[PDB]
C-alpha cells in the first residue's frame with residue numbers, strides 16, 4: 272500500500288459527501304446506492320462515518336464529467352481512465368469525478384460504479400495506488416464477476432487503518 | 445509499534461481479570477497458567493499489576509467462544525481468526541475472546557493458548573498491530589518458539605511503555 276506525499280488525511284472522523292450531478296446511464300436511485308455502498312466499505316474498517324449534503328460544500332464532492340470539466344485533469348473519452356479523485360484537504364481535495372464517456376452500471380456489463388467509487392473514495396481518504404495486485408487500490412480495473420464476493424483485501428485494510436485506525440467498536444484479532 | 449486511534453489506554457495501573465469459562469481442550473490449571481503467564485509478560489515491563497475476580501465485571505473478561513457469541517463479530521470455524529480482543533475502556537472493552545474451534549494446547553501442537561493470550565492482552569492494554577516481524581504484536585506472531593526461546597521484543601516493550609512507562613523499579 273502507498274499513501275500520498277505528506278500523508279494528507281482528514282482531521283475529522285465524520286465527513287460529508289454530496290452527489291453534485293447525475294449520469295444518463297443509471298437511474299438516480301442506482302447512483303446513490305452505489306455511492307453509499309462505496310463509502311460503507313471504508314466505514315466498516317475505520318472510525319469514519321459519512322453523511323449526505325444536498326446543498327453547500329461537502330468534503331467529498333462527487334460528480335460525473337466528460338473531457339474538459341473545470342479541473343486540472345481532463346478525461347480521455349471512452350476507455351482508459353474511468354475516474355479520478357483527490358487526496359484529502361480543502362476545496363478541490365477529496366473530490367471524486369467519474370468519466371461519463373464510460374457506461375456506468377449496477378452490475379458488470381459495463382463499468383461498475385460501486386467498484387470504481389470504492390477505489391476513488393480510497394483516494395479521497397488518503398490512499399494512493401497499491402503495489403499489491405489484489406488490493407482494491409491496485410491501479411487496474413478488470414474482469415470481475417462477483418460483487419457478492421466483495422471483501423476489501425488485507426492490504427487496503429492495513430493502508431486505511433494506518434491513517435485512521437480500526438473502528439472503536441471493533442475487536443482486533 | 446502501533447497504538448489504537450485516539451490512543452486509548454487505561455487510566456489506572458491496577459487492572460482486574462476474570463476467566464469466565466473454560467475450554468474442553470485443556471485442563472483448567474493450564475488455562476489459568478497460560479493466562480497468568482500472559483499477564484506477567486506485560487507486568488514485567490510496566491507498572492501494571494493484576495488481580496483475579498471470580499464474580500462481577502472485571503476490566504479484562506476472558507472467555508472461549510464459537511461462531512456467534514455475545515457480540516457483532518462471530519468467529520470463523522477452525523483456523524484463521526484464533527481470537528480477538530478489544531481496546532481499553534468500560535464494558536466489552538478490554539475483553540478477550542478465544543475461538544474454541546481451535547485446539548488450544550500448552551505446547552506447540554495446536555494453537556498455543558499462552559502465545560495468543562499474550563497477544564490478545566496486548567490489544568486489551570492498548571497496542572494495535574506492529575510492522576516488526578519478530579514482535580509479539582505482529583499479525584503472524586504464530587511462529588515464535590513460545591516458551592523456550594520466547595522473549596518480548598524491544599518493540600513490544602517500547603510500545604507498552606509509551607502508554608504506561610517502565611517498571612517503577
Ligand SMILES: CC(C)C[C@H](C(=O)NO)N(Cc1ccccc1)[P@](C)(=O)c1ccccc1
Pocket residue numbers: 351352353354355356386387390391394409410411412
Ligand atoms: C491516474 C489515475 C487517474 C488513473 C485511474 C485511477 O486509478 N483512478 O483513481 N485509472 C488507472 C489507469 C488509467 C489509464 C492507464 C493505466 C491505469 P482508472 C482505469 O480510472 C481505475 C479506476 C477504478 C479502479 C482501478 C483503476
Ligand SMILES: [Ca+2]
Pocket residue numbers: 329330331332360361362363364365366
Ligand atoms: Ca472537497
Ligand SMILES: [Ca+2]
Pocket residue numbers: 346347348349350351352353370372373
Ligand atoms: Ca475514459
Ligand SMILES: [Ca+2]
Pocket residue numbers: 294295296370371372373374375
Ligand atoms: Ca455515460
Ligand SMILES: [Ca+2]
Pocket residue numbers: 502503504505533534535536537538539
Ligand atoms: Ca471489560
Ligand SMILES: [Ca+2]
Pocket residue numbers: 519520521522523524525526543545546
Ligand atoms: Ca477460527
Ligand SMILES: [Ca+2]
Pocket residue numbers: 467468469543544545546547548
Ligand atoms: Ca477447542
Ligand SMILES: [Zn+2]
Pocket residue numbers: 336340342344355368
Ligand atoms: Zn476531474
Ligand SMILES: [Zn+2]
Pocket residue numbers: 390394400410
Ligand atoms: Zn486510482
Ligand SMILES: [Zn+2]
Pocket residue numbers: 443444563567573581583
Ligand atoms: Zn492481533
Ligand SMILES: [Zn+2]
Pocket residue numbers: 442509513514515517528541
Ligand atoms: Zn467476541
